[PDB]
């Protein structure tokens, strides 16, 4: 958190630390997004991805991610990405 | 001017500006 | 002993000298000297040329007095005359027909040498001519190594 009212300026609220167990779970999610882009990259479902994500904004930003880096290797559309 | 000439040069600058304006208008069209 | 000249060999040298010294100074410079030897058509080799430039202009001032130029160019023609004897000599060491002389043979010649030297430097010098490793020591490389300039 980039707070402004609390003590630390950008105050990381004294709540949590050592996020290994959940970022590790995130890490395979990023990998799941990594392969799922390759699935689209290789195949001509796609509705499976959009229904599995449901309402996870953060995870799809990662799915929005794994295409963008591939787009960077591929296209200038990454600028639009 | 001397003044006149200068003022005439200013008029020329204004005409160049108006020509640019007409170019913009044509682009719009 | 063969740093000697006639009026015609001096003619050859001064004629190559000519279109460099053309307004009158009496000397051609070492750069001018290299261009002299290149314009001959019989061009010099760079390793020979730089060291000869350093030698004839022993002080290294660039300008070369005419006696020095004559002595050096007489040395260049005795590179055709006297160095020929050394070349055909060390060619009889080319009996084996590859370009090289076996290392023990060069060691033998060195141990029977006039201005003697030391065997370790002679082995590294054997390698300096046997840069190929065929068990044998080069003949052109050796003679030009001691007689080019």
């Amino acid at each position: 958190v980039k707070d402004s009212q609390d003590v630390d300026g950008d105050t990381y609220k004294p709540i949590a630390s050592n996020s290994y167990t959940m970022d590790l779970h995130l890490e395979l999610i990023q990998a799941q997004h990594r392969i799922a882009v390759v699935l689209l990259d290789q195949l001509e479902t796609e509705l499976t991805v959009m229904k599995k994500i449901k309402k996870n904004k953060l995870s799809k930003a990662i799915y929005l991610m794994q295409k963008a880096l591939l787009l960077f290797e591929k296209d200038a559309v990454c600028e639009t990405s | 001017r001397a003044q006149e000439e200068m003022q005439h040069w200013l008029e020329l600058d204004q005409s160049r500006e108006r020509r640019l304006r007409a170019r913009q208008e044509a682009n719009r069209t | 002993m063969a740093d000697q000249l006639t009026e015609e060999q001096i003619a050859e040298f001064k004629e190559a000298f000519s279109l460099f010294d053309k307004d009158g100074d009496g000397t051609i410079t070492t750069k001018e000297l290299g261009t002299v030897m290149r314009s001959l058509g019989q061009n010099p080799t760079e390793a020979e040329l730089q060291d000869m430039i350093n030698e004839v202009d022993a002080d290294g001032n660039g300008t070369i007095d005419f006696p020095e130029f004559l002595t050096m160019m007489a040395r260049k023609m005795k590179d055709t005359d006297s160095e020929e004897e050394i070349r055909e000599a060390f060619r009889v060491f080319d009996k084996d027909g590859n370009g090289y002389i076996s290392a023990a043979e060069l060691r033998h010649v060195m141990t029977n040498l006039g201005e003697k030297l030391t065997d370790e430097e002679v082995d590294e010098m054997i390698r300096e001519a046997d840069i190929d490793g065929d068990g044998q020591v080069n003949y052109e490389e050796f003679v030009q190594m001691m007689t080019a300039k």
Binding site: - | E5, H8, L12, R19, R23, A26, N27, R28, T29 | -
Partner: protein, 181 residues
């Protein structure tokens, strides 16, 4: 040049209009251009802005007589040759350019009567002597000289200078009856 020519090519898309038959205006100022590819493929261009560049010569107007107004100021242009074969010019900007072969230019300019305006400040004539009246004597048909319209004082002194026979005509046909006054 062809790298930047896309913008001119994009002009049909810029205005969303039809085709190459629509060429009327062209603007390339402030791009330090020196020479233009042969414009004999284009169409009835009549207005041209190529000022604020490093242009030197013309090898591209081979049949571009269709131009009517030309703006080539602030350049290094030294070329007026064969332009007489394109006499349809009426207004020309040329300030900050390099023209010095003035008699040959006039010989070219004799076929360029269509010119109504021309600018010559910071051109060599503007820095010369005996310049304006010389041009007027050569070009009575050009009105806006350096865009500055000619006055009757300049015309009078030009007439007095350039045709001495006509000057004595002026003095004699009136009366010129006696010499010392």
């Amino acid at each position: 040049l062809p790298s930047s020519l896309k913008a001119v090519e994009d002009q049909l898309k810029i205005c969303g209009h039809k085709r190459d038959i629509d060429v009327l205006e062209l603007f390339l100022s402030k791009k330090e251009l020196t020479e233009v590819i042969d414009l004999s493929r284009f169409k009835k261009l009549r207005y041209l802005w190529l000022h604020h560049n490093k242009l030197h010569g013309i090898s591209f107007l081979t049949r571009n007589y269709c131009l009517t107004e030309l703006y080539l100021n602030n350049n290094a242009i030294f070329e007026i040759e064969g332009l007489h074969n394109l006499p349809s010019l009426n207004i020309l900007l040329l300030h900050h350019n390099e023209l010095t072969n003035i008699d040959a230019t006039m010989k070219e300019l004799k076929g360029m009567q269509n010119l109504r305006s021309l600018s010559l400040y910071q051109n060599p004539l503007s820095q010369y002597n005996l310049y304006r009246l010389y041009i007027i004597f050569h070009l009575p048909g050009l009105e806006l000289l350096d865009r500055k319209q000619i006055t009757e004082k300049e015309r009078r002194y030009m007439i007095t200078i350039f045709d001495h026979k006509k000057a004595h005509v002026i003095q004699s046909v009136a009366f010129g009856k006696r010499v010392d006054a």
